[PDB]
Each structure stands twice: as structure tokens, then as C-alpha cells.
């Protein structure tokens, strides 16, 4: 139930090495505008 | 499927009207029985007179389960109640007036006397 020992600063940072985030789609909209998310229709600042 | 403590109608004039199973004899751990399987059983409702009386422990063969048997040709047979014939420890019965239909699947269990004392076998 409770942790018997504290986790160190080293063990904590080894656990959250897969606690990351990915870069998204980022495809250009060839008609007009900035980068749209891939396989998505744009809403603002683009023509998809 | 006939296990311990199932009430069965008794299908002859052996002296019993209702009987409940103690064990399904056969092997060790044997849980259920069907047509052709001998069970050891105590009579609960007995006819006044006859041979067996209430509280006797008798051996008896299963005829006509409600969850009947499957045949080699993919055929099935099922009955509307579970019945039973009290036997006399040589695969021969106690009575001479076996009641109701008997399944065919106990011809090959050497219960030919039970077949000959019965109505139409199906």
C-alpha cells in the first residue's frame, strides 16, 4: 500500500523516460494556409 | 445428467415410486450418469407392500433421462422425466412390469431382461 522507501531522483527519471509526447502529423495544405494535421480538413488559416 | 441427490421416478413394480441417488458408480470422481449407467440409491416414496421399502439402499439402472443420449448417426432422443429400474445385482430387475418407454442404448449394456419386460423401445 505505501512505499517502503522513497524513490530517488535517479529512479524517478528512469521511470519517466517513456513519459514523452510525439510530434503530430504536420502536412502542408497545398491550396492555401499553414500546416494541417495529416488526413484532416482545415478550419482556420488554411484552405483544406 | 443425473448426479447425487436427484429424485427419479421408479419405472417398474419393484415397490418404489421415487428414489434419490447416492453415488454414480463406475469410476472415482464420476459426477453424472445417463441411460445404461447403474446408480445406487435410496427409495423415498415407496408403495405399501411390494419388495423394497422406504429407506432401503438399492442399486438401479437409468432408463430415459430428461437430457437424453446422442447416437452414432447424429440422432438424439429425449424424455419428459427421469426414470429408473431397480435391479438385482446381476443386471436383472426386481419387477416384472417395467413401465414407460426405454431408450435403445441399454440393449448393449446387457440389460436384455429390462428390454423384454418393457413397452416399445425407442
Amino acid at each position: 500500500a505505501v512505499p517502503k522507501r522513497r524513490t530517488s531522483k535517479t529512479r524517478k527519471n528512469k521511470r519517466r523516460t517513456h513519459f514523452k509526447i510525439s510530434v503530430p502529423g504536420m502536412t502542408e495544405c497545398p491550396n492555401c494556409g499553414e500546416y494541417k494535421l495529416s488526413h484532416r480538413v482545415c478550419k482556420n488559416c488554411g484552405s483544406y | 445428467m443425473i448426479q447425487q441427490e436427484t429424485r427419479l421416478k421408479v419405472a417398474d413394480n419393484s415397490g418404489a415410486r421415487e428414489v434419490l441417488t447416492i453415488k454414480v458408480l463406475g469410476g472415482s470422481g464420476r459426477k453424472t450418469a445417463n441411460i445404461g449407467d447403474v446408480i445406487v440409491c435410496t427409495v423415498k416414496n415407496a408403495t405399501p407392500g411390494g419388495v423394497v421399502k422406504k429407506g432401503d439402499v438399492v442399486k438401479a439402472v437409468i432408463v430415459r433421462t430428461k437430457s437424453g443420449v446422442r447416437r452414432n448417426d447424429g440422432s438424439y432422443i429425449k424424455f419428459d422425466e427421469n426414470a429408473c429400474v431397480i435391479i438385482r445385482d446381476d443386471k436383472g430387475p426386481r419387477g416384472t412390469r417395467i413401465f414407460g418407454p426405454v431408450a435403445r442404448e441399454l440393449r448393449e449394456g446387457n440389460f436384455m431382461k429390462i428390454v423384454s419386460l418393457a413397452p416399445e423401445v425407442l
Binding site: 494535421l37 488526413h39 484532416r40 480538413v41 478550419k43 | -
Partner: protein, 120 residues
């Protein structure tokens, strides 16, 4: 089929109110899973409209809510009359389709994939 996070009647009531409003406005903005499932609902309901007989008029009213469209020149047709009268005349040659799903970005309160479902 998808359960959409609701009961058998909460899903059924949600799915025919979402199919009625895609007959009224002809393009609605929903989430992605709720548009994957109302896709097969309204396309099976335009199929009843291309028939146009009385027996399938009774079947399209199993599904459609009693919503009145204010059309042009202050004339009012119901969503049952607008299904057999306008959408049924548009797709009388097409053998399927009748909708499309255009994906959009996540919402702000959720990561819910926004989707426009249109009526083609």
C-alpha cells in the same frame, strides 16, 4: 457496432436525433465515433426514401424525430416530407455513398476528434 458510451436506449435516442439533424441542415459537426455510427443510420434512411412507397414511409418514421423545417417562402415541411422529397430526388441515380466524413482537429475541452459529416 459501437456502443458510444451509453445505454441501449440512450444510444438509440441519440442516433436518430443525430440522423434527423443531418436531414435538416445537411451537414453537422459531431465527434468521429458518433459520425461513424450515424453514417450507417442515415444512409439506410435515404434508401427508404428512394423507394417512396407507403410501407417505407412508415419505416422512415420509425427513426425520424418530429422536426419541422422552415423552408423558403415561409413554407413548412416535416423532416419526413423532406427526406422523401428532396434527398430522395438528389440520389435517385447513385447506388450508395450519400454521406462523407471530413476529419478535423481535436476539440479544446477534450481530445475528441471533431468531424463534419456532410450529405453527398
Amino acid at each position: 457496432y459501437r456502443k458510444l458510451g451509453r445505454t441501449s436506449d440512450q444510444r438509440k435516442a441519440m442516433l436518430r436525433d443525430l440522423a434527423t439533424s443531418l436531414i435538416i441542415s445537411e451537414r453537422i459537426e459531431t465527434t468521429e465515433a458518433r459520425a461513424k455510427e450515424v453514417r450507417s443510420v442515415v444512409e439506410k434512411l435515404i434508401t427508404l426514401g428512394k423507394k417512396g412507397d407507403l410501407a417505407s414511409r412508415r419505416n422512415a418514421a420509425k427513426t425520424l424525430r418530429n422536426v419541422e423545417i422552415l423552408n423558403e417562402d415561409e413554407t413548412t415541411q416535416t423532416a419526413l416530407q423532406k427526406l422523401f422529397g428532396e434527398i430522395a430526388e438528389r440520389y435517385t441515380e447513385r447506388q450508395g455513398g450519400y454521406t462523407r466524413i471530413l476529419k478535423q482537429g481535436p476539440r479544446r475541452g477534450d481530445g475528441a476528434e471533431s468531424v463534419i459529416i456532410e450529405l453527398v
